[PDB]
A paper describes a structure:
Brachyury is a transcription factor that plays an essential role in tumour growth of the rare bone cancer chordoma and is implicated in other solid tumours. The DNA binding domain forms an immunoglobulin-like fold and contacts DNA via an unusual insertion of an α-helix into the minor groove.
For X-ray fragment screening in the absence of DNA, we used a shorter construct (amino acids 41–211) lacking the C-terminal helix that inserts into the DNA minor groove, which was observed to be flexible in our early DNA-free crystallization efforts. WT and G177D DNA-free crystals were obtained in different conditions with different crystal forms although both generally diffracted to around 1.6 Å. The structures of WT and G177D brachyury in the absence of DNA are almost identical to their counterparts bound to DNA (R.M.S.D. 0.36 and 0.37, respectively), including the significant differences observed around the G177D variant despite different crystal packing interactions, thus validating that these differences are not crystallographic artifacts. Encouraged by the discovery of ligandable pockets on brachyury, we have initiated a medicinal chemistry campaign to optimize the potency of fragment-derived molecules.
Residue numbers in the entry: 41 to 211
């Protein structure tokens, strides 16, 4: 009944084919592509919050060497579990289902300096994950959804010149 589908999945797959990269900065940088999902099967009458976090994908970091990503060493200690609350939260099921849910404003940083940003470790791979939480639920039920097409490596600068070009092209 509940269905959460990735929007613009073909576009994410073009980046994933190259190995996607997302820039992190001291002040925080918005993602491109933007993560957007369509939702059906919630109770239109109920209220829900939408949350976003980033799950580390490997037990090692990465390095771009001779035009290829390769295992690049031991990981750094895990980033703190930062969660991003979608600014429309809390809202009716009808609100979330009437048009795609877009996380256009989240910013990724390599420095914990508030502002509701997500701290990531450079040269580590992450996968976005969305959680739906129902308001007023004594069971505190939450549903979690992963998006394999949206995996990316966090970078202080683009390594792959094809990614640099792709980002300029489709944006
Ligand atoms: C009265 N009634 C019982 C079923 C009657 N047919 C409901 O409230 C209801 C009705 C229709 C659809 C859903 N949708 C469910 C689907 C999962 N979910 C949910 C998702 C994320 C977090 C917490 C969650 F509880 C919902 O709220 C609920």
């Amino acid at each position: 009944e509940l269905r959460v589908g990735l929007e613009e999945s073909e576009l994410w797959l073009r980046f994933k084919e190259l190995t996607n990269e997302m820039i992190v900065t001291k002040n925080g940088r918005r993602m491109f592509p933007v993560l957007k999902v369509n939702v059906s099967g919630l109770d239109p009458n109920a209220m829900y919050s939408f949350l976003l976090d980033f799950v580390a994908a490997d037990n090692h970091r990465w390095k771009y060497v001779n035009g290829e990503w390769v295992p690049g060493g031991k990981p750094e200690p895990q980033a703190p579990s930062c969660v991003y609350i979608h600014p429309d939260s809390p809202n009716f099921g009808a609100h979330w289902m009437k048009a795609p849910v877009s996380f256009s404003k989240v910013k990724l940083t390599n420095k914990l300096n508030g502002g509701g940003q997500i701290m990531l470790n450079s040269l580590h791979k992450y996968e976005p994950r969305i959680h739906i939480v129902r308001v007023g639920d004594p069971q505190r039920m939450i549903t979690s959804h992963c998006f394999p097409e949206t995996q990316f490596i966090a970078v202080t600068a683009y390594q792959n010149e094809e990614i640099t070009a792709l980002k300029i092209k489709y944006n």
